Design a protein around this motif. Structure first.
Motif, PDB file in Angstrom:
ATOM      1  N   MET A 134      12.806  18.537  -0.421  1.00  0.00           N
ATOM      2  CA  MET A 134      12.522  19.711   0.245  1.00  0.00           C
ATOM      3  C   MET A 134      13.742  20.147   1.358  1.00  0.00           C
ATOM      4  N   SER A 135      14.624  19.078   1.548  1.00  0.00           N
ATOM      5  CA  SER A 135      15.741  19.345   2.628  1.00  0.00           C
ATOM      6  C   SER A 135      16.693  18.256   2.342  1.00  0.00           C
ATOM      7  N   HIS A 136      16.253  17.472   1.480  1.00  0.00           N
ATOM      8  CA  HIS A 136      17.260  16.291   1.332  1.00  0.00           C
ATOM      9  C   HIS A 136      18.060  16.428  -0.098  1.00  0.00           C
ATOM     10  N   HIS A 137      17.855  17.620  -0.765  1.00  0.00           N
ATOM     11  CA  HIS A 137      18.787  17.800  -2.167  1.00  0.00           C
ATOM     12  C   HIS A 137      18.253  19.172  -2.157  1.00  0.00           C
TER      13      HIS A 137
ATOM     14  N   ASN B 267      15.488  24.561   0.870  1.00  0.00           N
ATOM     15  CA  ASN B 267      16.607  23.915   0.106  1.00  0.00           C
ATOM     16  C   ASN B 267      16.866  24.835  -1.069  1.00  0.00           C
TER      17      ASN B 267
HETATM   18 CL   LIG Z   1      14.534  17.600   0.450  1.00  0.00          CL
END
Ligand SMILES: [Cl-]
Ligand SMILES: NS(=O)(=O)c1ccc(NC(=O)Nc2ccc(C(F)(F)F)cc2)cc1
Ligand SMILES: [Zn+2]
Length: 260
Positions: A1-4, A11
């Motif tokens: 959701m914001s890590h990739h 994201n």
């Molecule tokens: Cl993420």
């Protein structure tokens, strides 16, 4: 959701330019195809789709779509003609789709969104491998096919049947002996324009060939797409839906049509 990178609020496509500044480039995809501005080009040749010897390998949930990979070591399944110079080998196909039947396609046609879009991805053999092709302005050719909901597409059913085995990110399965000829509509009439990959790295090396005729797929077929997950096994379940990039500015480009 914001890590990739992905398709969510934190994201999604509005964020991609930070890691991939070409996202704001001069030849990004997809685009809206304005059918009244596209120019019929009588010098475009018919497209040649030669998929009889295609050698499928695997099907994979890569966390952004599902993809079927082919052996591209030799000229087995190739695309030639149309706007293309030389021979382009089929590497993979995948889809983009929506949460509802009025969205899901990447390209639009007079602002019309289709339920889904199939991308058959090919690379230019003059560059020897796909990694090198990805660095060239004419390295790739993607054949885009719209999906609308109607009767079932029989050639899609073997794909649908396996999706329950690749529910989450990173899962793969054997997918040999699949014939991609069964995914095509009757007509090969098309629009073409120079563009990009529609996912990171957004490389500006694609000749887009978008077929005018959609294929029809059944409600049950699309529902099976919508059961896939973005997440890996054990993570909170986030259904894989709305994995499409919206239309990008056309900038200094002309879309050509193969048909009047
Ligand atoms: Cl993420
Ligand atoms: N949505 S779209 O049709 O514009 C689209 C977006 C991204 C890609 N990227 C690749 O196929 N990348 C790739 C595949 C395969 C390999 C391999 F493993 F073979 F080296 C190395 C790179 C293609 C198309
Ligand atoms: Zn795609």
């Amino acid at each position: 959701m914001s890590h990739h990178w992905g398709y969510g609020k934190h994201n999604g496509p509005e964020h991609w330019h930070k890691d991939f500044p070409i996202a704001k480039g001069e030849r990004q995809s997809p685009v809206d195809i304005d059918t009244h501005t596209a120019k019929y080009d009588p010098s475009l040749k018919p497209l040649s789709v030669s998929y009889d010897q295609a050698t499928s390998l695997r099907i994979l949930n890569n966390g952004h779509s599902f993809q079927v990979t082919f052996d591209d070591s030799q000229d087995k399944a190739v695309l030639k003609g149309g706007p293309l110079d030389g021979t382009y080998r089929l590497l993979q196909f995948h889809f983009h789709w929506g949460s509802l039947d009025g969205q899901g396609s990447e390209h639009t046609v007079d602002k019309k969104k289709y339920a889904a879009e199939l991308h058959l991805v090919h690379w230019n053999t003059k560059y020897g491998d796909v990694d090198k092709a990805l660095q060239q302005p004419d390295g790739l050719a993607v054949l885009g096919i719209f999906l609308k909901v109607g009767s079932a597409k029989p050639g899609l059913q073997k794909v649908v049947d396996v999706l329950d085995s690749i529910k989450t990110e990173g899962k793969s399965a054997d997918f040999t002996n699949f014939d991609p000829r069964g995914l095509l509509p009757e007509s090969l009439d098309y629009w073409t324009y120079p563009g990009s990959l529609t996912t990171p790295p957004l490389a500006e090396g694609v000749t887009w060939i978008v077929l005018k005729e959609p294929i029809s797929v059944s409600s049950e077929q699309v529902l099976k797409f919508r059961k896939l997950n973005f997440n890996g096994e054990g993570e909170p379940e986030e259904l894989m839906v709305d994995n499409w990039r919206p239309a990008q500015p056309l900038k200094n480009r002309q879309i050509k049509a193969s048909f009047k």
